[PDB]
Amino acid sequence: VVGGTEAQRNSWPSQISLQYRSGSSWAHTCGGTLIRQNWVMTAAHCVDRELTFRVVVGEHNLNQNDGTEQYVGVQKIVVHPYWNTDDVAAGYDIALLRLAQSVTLNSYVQLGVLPRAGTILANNSPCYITGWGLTRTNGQLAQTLQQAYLPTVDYAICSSSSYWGSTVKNSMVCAGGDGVRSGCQGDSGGPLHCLVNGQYAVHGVTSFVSRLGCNVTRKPTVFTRVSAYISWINNVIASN
Ligand SMILES: [Ca+2]
Numbered sequence: 001v002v003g004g005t006e007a008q009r010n011s012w013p014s015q016i017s018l019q020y021r022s023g024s025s026w027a028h029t030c031g032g033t034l035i036r037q038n039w040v041m042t043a044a045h046c047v048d049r050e051l052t053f054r055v056v057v058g059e060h061n062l063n064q065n066d067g068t069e070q071y072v073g074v075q076k077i078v079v080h081p082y083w084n085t086d087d088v089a090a091g092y093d094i095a096l097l098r099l100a101q102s103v104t105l106n107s108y109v110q111l112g113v114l115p116r117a118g119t120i121l122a123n124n125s126p127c128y129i130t131g132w133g134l135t136r137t138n139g140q141l142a143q144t145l146q147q148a149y150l151p152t153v154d155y156a157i158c159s160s161s162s163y164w165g166s167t168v169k170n171s172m173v174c175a176g177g178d179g180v181r182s183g184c185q186g187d188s189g190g191p192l193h194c195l196v197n198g199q200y201a202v203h204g205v206t207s208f209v210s211r212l213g214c215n216v217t218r219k220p221t222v223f224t225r226v227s228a229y230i231s232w233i234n235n236v237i238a239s240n
């Protein structure tokens with residue numbers, strides 16, 4: 001997250017860190033949203049690589065013991081069947097990870113609330129992106145979980161020529177584009193939390209930013225629209 005602030009430890013308890021095994025260690029690669037005690041919602045693109053993945057819930061600082069982390073293997077990966085790694089603009093950038101164990105819920109570990117199917121946010125709706133992604137274009141991952149206030153940019157604006165044009169689909173949520181604040185690499189798969197009727201819900205799964213850079217004016221961060229996938233999600237969970 002570019003232009004973020006450090007999240008309070010218990011603000012976003014459904015945020016997870018999706019990590020891959022690298023040597024004798026683990027590296028954060030993506031965010032995710034805990035949606036059941038044994039299921040994480042993330043971006044399909046986060047799991048195109050044939051890596052060993054684990055999920056960390058209750059994580060705050062990737063570089064320090066927080067005393068709240070639970071580490072769990074990824075047991076099964078269910079990528080949306082229409083995902084095509086060579087065409088992120090087509091959408092379907094969503095995947096569910098069944099965790100090898102059910103995590104224990106507490107103030108640091110909670111299920112993300114998802115919007116009802118079909119819900120579309122009015123333009124300029126208040127949301128925060130959260131994640132450990134780069135803090136600058138071509139920068140480095142955050143140590144501490146970051147949040148940035150990224151108001152939505154509706155489809156009509158987002159899919160306009162000076163924004164994302166045809167690249168953005170109605171199955172996506174755009175947010176931000178102010179040139180200051182944005183998602184950035186390593187935020188992928190994580191939530192966009194939007195305040196609706198007093199409650200934050202995870203409306204987006206971070207999907208992409210401009211190849212030119214993270215915080216590029218009129219290139220808001222683009223998220224998979226969670227409310228486009230509620231049936232899919234429920235179908236997956238019910239069949240697994
Ligand atoms: Ca930690």
Ligand SMILES: [Cl-]
Binds near residue numbers: 013014110111112
């Ligand atoms: Cl949360």
